[PDB]
Nucleic acid binder design. Sequence first.
RNA 1: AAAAUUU
RNA 2: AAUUU
Length: 536
Amino acid sequence: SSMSYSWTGALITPCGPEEEKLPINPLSNSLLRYHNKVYCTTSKSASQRAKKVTFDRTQVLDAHYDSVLKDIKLAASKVSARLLTLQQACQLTPPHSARSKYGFGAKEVRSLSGRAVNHIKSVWKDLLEDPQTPIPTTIMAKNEVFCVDPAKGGKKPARLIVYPDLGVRVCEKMALYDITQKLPQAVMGASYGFQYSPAQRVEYLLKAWAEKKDPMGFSYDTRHFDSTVTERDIRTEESIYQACSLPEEARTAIHSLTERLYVGGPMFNSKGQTCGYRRCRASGVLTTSMGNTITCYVKALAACKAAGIVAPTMLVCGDDLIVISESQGTEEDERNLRAFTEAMTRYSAPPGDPPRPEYDLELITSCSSNVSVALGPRGRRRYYLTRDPTTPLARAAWETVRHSPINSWLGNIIQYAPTIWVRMVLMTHFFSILMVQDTLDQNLGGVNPLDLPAIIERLHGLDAFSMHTYSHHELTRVASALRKLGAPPLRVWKSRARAVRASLISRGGKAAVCGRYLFNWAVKTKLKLTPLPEAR
RNA sequence: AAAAUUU
RNA sequence: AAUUU
Ligand SMILES: C[C@@]1(O)[C@H](O)[C@@H](COP(=O)(O)OP(=O)(O)O)O[C@H]1n1ccc(=O)[nH]c1=O
Ligand SMILES: [Cl-]
Ligand SMILES: [Mn+2]
Ligand SMILES: [Mn+2]
Ligand SMILES: [Mn+2]
């Protein structure tokens, strides 16, 4: 029935200019050599993306769907949710949010300039009066950095971002922000992934695993999820929103956004031409994340039911899903998973790669990450979260006139501090760089490099400084990724680390603490690391 | 472009 | 600011 998009043939033009790497990358040329492999997805590539996501959806629901949808509305209605004042919504706007066509941007919105507020007032008026005229949206290519992979095609084409004008974005928040804060957790409970921290994610998975007599796990991800979302899914989304206690004024705003924006509309490129027409999710609207998550969850819980998955414990984040169930033997597990996929496929959520039962927690990947295990200081098993370092390393080498990658180095150091690739490679590089630069004291992304030990002890536990005996999968994957980007292998990073360590120690102060906690892995005779005052 | 988590 | 979807 529904085509996902149609296209005039106008191009998807760039919003800014898309910078090139330069013949010299002075921050990362000591980190890796293969700079030719590191690229940013361009707007020229958007054409290729559009072909891959334009297709005809058909959808066939069933008693299991209906049943799951019903139960989900009974959950929804134990929720009441308020409108947000025009003003409170204005100030959830991000500081750099793309400006409005009507002569103001986010500074004005956040400061409640009166031109901005009056335009927003009229926009909300029109939402309440007119509940049908479609609302124009802008279409743009997302710029992100990867490492080329010739196995899987060369370069990925850019994903498509589709969004309404700033005025409209504020009105969405007025109508729905409060819902986004309450509905998913109410509807999905413990299954709602975003509620958890990484530590909690890991623990939730181990508890789920431990409680099965005989566990089986898998993960699922939908190919081009936003384009698989049907008009009917979006209206069913509305009807889930409506099932809460709402002010009548919200209901009209919800219903109107739904019919005017969410289910479809025309799309314009940055130069103003009509680009095409859309009848799936616009990724760029306030409801993108909540919607995806709720919709994914309905389809998934139904498909579990269609396929016989026993005692499923779920975890859902957007279109990404893990299910840990009671195995019915491998012959049955294979068959049930094929059934799961058939169902999701009927529901219009077809797999990127077909899923597969697993019986070892390390082999389940979701949101480009997985759980792994090492040994702690006293020899106890320590479970932690990690990932292929390929992309983060490529992003670590993205230097342009307009972009430094140092913040990315730090981001990953914090998020993945227990991993062997952060501890040996990124930490070593980061500290080496700043020492020589003599900018340790300086803040970056509102964090002081010299706090890191406290920060990591707070977030990952003191065990992140003493972990050893990493897994084969993890050693293999790391070695393989450093070889792939032409970076030095782990032994060299051991040498560089000893030096960085010595120089930090002999600097005294917080540096020396950094050098002793972060790099104790690097010395032959360890120290005994005690908790840190600063952390509690 | 939107959200969540981390800080 | 970082990461993720
Ligand atoms: C664009 C999205 O709606 C997207 O389709 C969905 C699932 O992401 P995915 O990583 O599995 O990609 P597919 O589209 O399924 O190929 O998460 C949203 N999403 C994802 C990435 C992003 O920057 N913004 C976004 O709103
Ligand atoms: Cl231990
Ligand atoms: Mn997907
Ligand atoms: Mn309605
Ligand atoms: Mn996904």
